Amino acid sequence: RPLWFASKQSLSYLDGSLPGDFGFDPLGLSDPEGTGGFIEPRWLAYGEIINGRYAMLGAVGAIAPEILGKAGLIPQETALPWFQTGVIPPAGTYNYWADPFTLFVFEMALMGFAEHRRLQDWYNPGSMGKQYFLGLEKGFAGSGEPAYPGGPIFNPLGFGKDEKSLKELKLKEVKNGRLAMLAILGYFIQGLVTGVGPYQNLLDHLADPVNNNILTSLKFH
């Protein structure tokens, strides 16, 4: 098994069972001794998976409108950098069909449902197949593993029926997730330093490599 910056303490609990395990834990945050709160190794892996999935959504969602505007696919007024779409009102605001606080309330309610349900699956496995919820609860029974519930709603195409295929797909998911959250951190830092958007940063790097670097950007903007 390949190991990247593995430690003697880290190898005492990282035995390769979890997907994407390379022994990397210099700080020992997943140590199973004195474990409580949110520092549980299962909770840490679950949070890594959820953060990776959300960042795989976000790293494409924060760069797709800019690419579509450059390609002239759908109108350029909706083609803005990710900080110019009302996320940061000083950076830019777009006039949607609703006030940003009203949209925040709508999002908060919908995700409160869709995420407190997930939290109660984590607390009590299989508890969302019991109570009546619009008749959809039959698809919310889960599989005993909170990060990978499966079922006809979350796994409709039936991908990875085989165990080796499931393990390979889990490894692919965690690796692409880690890359995506690295990309999201890069988006944030490039917005803080340059402030022109990540796709514009890529275009400036492609047009000239020497004049547009991390080194020739410390002047900020």
Partner 1 sequence: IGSSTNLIMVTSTTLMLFAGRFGLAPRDSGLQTGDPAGFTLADTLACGSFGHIIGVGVVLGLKNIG
Partner 2 sequence: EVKILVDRDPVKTSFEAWAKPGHFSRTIAKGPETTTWIWNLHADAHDFDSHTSDLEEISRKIFSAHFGQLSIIFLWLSGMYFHGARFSNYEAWLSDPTHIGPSAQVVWPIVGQEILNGDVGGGFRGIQITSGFFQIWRASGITSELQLYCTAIGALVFAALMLFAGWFHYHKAAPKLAWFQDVESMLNHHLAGLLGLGSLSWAGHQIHVSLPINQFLNAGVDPKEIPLPHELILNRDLLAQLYPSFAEGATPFFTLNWSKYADFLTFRGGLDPVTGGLWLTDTAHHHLAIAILFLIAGHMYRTNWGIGHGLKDILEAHKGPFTGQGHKGLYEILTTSWHAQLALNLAMLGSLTIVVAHHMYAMPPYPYLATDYGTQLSLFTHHMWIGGFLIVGAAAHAAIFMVRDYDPTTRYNDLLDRVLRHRDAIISHLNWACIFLGFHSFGLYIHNDTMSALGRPQDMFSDTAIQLQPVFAQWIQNTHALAPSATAPGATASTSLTWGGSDLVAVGGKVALLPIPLGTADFLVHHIHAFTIHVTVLILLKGVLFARSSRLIPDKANLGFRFPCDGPGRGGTCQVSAWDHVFLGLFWMYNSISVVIFHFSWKMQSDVWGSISDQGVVTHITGGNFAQSSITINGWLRDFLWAQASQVIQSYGSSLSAYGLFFLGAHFVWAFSLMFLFSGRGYWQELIESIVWAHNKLKVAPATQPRALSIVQGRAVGVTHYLLGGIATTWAFFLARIIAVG
Residue ranges of the annotated binding site are 22, 24, 30, 48, 51, 53, 87, 115-116, 118, 150, 172-173, 175-176, 178, 190, 205, 214, 217
| Stretch 162-181 residues interacting with ligand CLA (CB under 6 A) | 178, 181
Q: Is 26 in the site for partner 1 (CB under 8 A)?
A: yes
Q: Which of residues 151-170 bind partner 1 (CB under 8 A)?
A: none
The reply on whether position 29 binds ligand CLA by CB under 6 A is yes
123 interacts with partner 2 by CB under 8 A = no
12-31 residues near partner 2, rule: CB under 8 A? 26-29, 31
Tell me the C-alpha distance between 21 and 14, whole Å.
7
Strand partners, 24: 6
Using the rule CB under 8 A, give the single segment among 7-15, 29-37, 104-112, 118-126 that binds partner 1.
Answer: 7-15
CB atoms within 10 A of CB 39: 13
Q: How far apart are CA 215 and CA 213, in angstroms?
A: 5
45 near ligand CLA, judged by CB under 6 A: yes
Query: Given candidates 1, 16, 39, 154, which one binds partner 2 under the rule CB under 8 A?
Result: 39
6 lines the binding site for partner 1 (CB under 8 A)? yes
Q: Which does 218 bind (CB under 5 to 8 A by kind): partner 2, partner 1, ligand CLA, none?
A: partner 2
Instruction: Phi first, then psi: give them for residue 188, nearest 5 degrees.
Output: -65, -45
SS3 24: strand
Under 8 Å between Cβ of 108 and 117: no
Q: Min. distance of Cβ 11 from ligand CLA in angstroms? A: 10
Neighbours of 212 (CB within 10 A): 18
Nearest to 124 by CA among 146, 109, 139: 146
- Residue 184 binds ligand CLA, judged by CB under 6 A: no
Residues in CB range of 169: below 8 A, 6 or more apart: 159, 160
User: Binding-site residues for chlorophyll a, please?
Assistant: 22, 24, 30, 48, 51, 87, 115-116, 118, 150, 172-173, 175-176, 178, 190, 205, 214, 217
- C-beta of 90 vs 156, nearer to partner 2: 90
Nearest CA-CA partner of 214 in 187, 194, 185, 184: 194
